[PDB]
């Protein structure tokens, strides 16, 4: 029975397994090969991955996401208390550990951040068992370099409530370097960067590994950067067609913002291999439609400062590892984002023309990863 791989992100969630000599990265039931890391609450039912993304506009109270950012913390930990005033579900204290509070079934129920990862990584297990046609029960798991024991330890406990032996806790960007091969080699140093531009983080990593050994030289980059300040942009700007078409302002509309915002992260997407997006947006705001279109040549001017500032963590980094540029023998593409053609102009760019590792998806390259590792342990 295969190992899995499952990369557990802050805003989408991916499972791959390698078996027959290579890895496939494993669709939904929707046919999405990444899962929306989201859990949603009902009067009658737990709602999880798209279903759940699905109704958040709908049922905003009651729609737990961006649980990685809570995970192993303290309640009173400022990370903590500066992210609470930005969500529209409410946190609690349970003995200094945080709690999300929410109806359900028609009671007022608390739940754990391990508690909710451990539901999205269930759904993660059952599409795993859906393609293989069989149980699931060890898997590999993966977490950003920067976390502590405590956030380990969370995200472990996670997996076992979901009912996986987690056969390890092992880092992203080591995850995204397996999946290139890149520690295949014996002595020599080889220095790689792995650019990671995911919807709600952005990491840069440098890593050196020699004869299979990773040693991480530096990290950098933004907690709050990522896909999500993008589809933004492109809610501010058609917030203001909308605003010249209509007179109205539907900025204060929480329902409207958000439904915006989805029709915004779905045209992004489309930008990324076509140069034009169609929305179209029943009933809106007030029940007036938006139908309306975007170029990717806009979008690029609409986020220009956004894509730009990721290069200075790139500077910071090298700078910490004390390496020049040329040195890189590797730059390793991860994140959703990093599948807009501007980002990577900019990266390669930066990098006077080297290669950008990208054949693997760049939002499956830590499942991938993740995927082999789990195979590997199991021998
Ligand atoms: N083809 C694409 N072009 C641009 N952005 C994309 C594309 N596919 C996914 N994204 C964005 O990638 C972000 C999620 O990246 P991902 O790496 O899957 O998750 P996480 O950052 O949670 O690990 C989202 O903002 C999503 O809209
Ligand atoms: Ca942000
Ligand atoms: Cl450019
Ligand atoms: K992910
Ligand atoms: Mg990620």
């Known amino acids: 029975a295969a190992a899995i791989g499952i990369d557990l992100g802050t805003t989408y969630s ?22 929306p890391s989201y859990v949603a609450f009902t009067d009658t039912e737990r709602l999880i991955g798209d279903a759940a993304k699905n109704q958040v506009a709908l049922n905003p109270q009651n729609t737990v996401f961006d649980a990685k950012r809570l995970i192993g913390r303290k309640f009173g930990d400022p990370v903590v208390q500066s992210d609470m005033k930005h969500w529209p579900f409410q946190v609690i204290n349970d003995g200094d550990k945080p709690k999300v509070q929410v109806s359900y079934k028609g009671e007022t129920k608390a739940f754990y951040p391990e508690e909710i990862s451990s539901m999205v990584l269930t759904k993660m297990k059952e599409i795993a068992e859906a393609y293989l046609g069989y149980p699931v029960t060890n898997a590999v ?5 920067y976390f502590n024991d405590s956030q380990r330890q969370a995200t472990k406990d996670a997996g076992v409530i979901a009912g996986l032996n987690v ?6 960007p080591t995850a995204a370097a397996i999946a290139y091969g890149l520690d295949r080699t014996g002595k020599g140093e080889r220095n790689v960067l792995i650019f990671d531009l995911g ?7 440098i890593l050196t590994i020699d004869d299979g050994i990773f040693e991480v030289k530096a990290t950098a980059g933004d907690t709050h950067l990522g896909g999500e300040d993008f589809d933004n942009r492109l809610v501010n700007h058609f917030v203001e067609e909308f605003k010249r078409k209509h007179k ?37 705001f007030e029940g007036i439609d938006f139908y309306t279109s975007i170029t990717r040549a806009r979008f690029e001017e609409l986020c220009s400062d956004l894509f730009r500032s990721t290069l200075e963590p790139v500077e910071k980094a090298l700078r910490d590892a004390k390496l020049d540029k040329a040195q890189i023998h590797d730059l390793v593409l991860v994140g959703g984002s990093t599948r ?8 390669q760019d930066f990098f006077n023309g080297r290669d950008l590792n990208k054949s693997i998806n760049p939002d499956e390259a830590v499942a991938y990863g993740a995927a082999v590792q789990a195979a590997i342990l199991m021998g």
């Open 199 to 205: 919807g709600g983080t952005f990491d840069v990593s």
């Open 141 to 145: 798991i993966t977490v950003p370099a």
């Open 248 to 284: 109205k302002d539907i900025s204060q509309n929480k329902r409207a913002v958000r439904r915006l915002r989805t029709a915004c992260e779905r045209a992004k997407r489309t930008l990324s291999s076509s140069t034009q997006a169609s929305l179209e947006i029943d009933s809106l």
């Open 167 to 172: 056969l390890r806790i092992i880092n992203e």
């Open 340 to 347: 807009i053609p501007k980002v990577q102009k900019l990266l």
């Open 14 to 35: 991916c499972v791959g397994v390698f078996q027959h000599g290579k890895v496939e990265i494993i669709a939904n039931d929707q046919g999405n090969r990444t899962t």
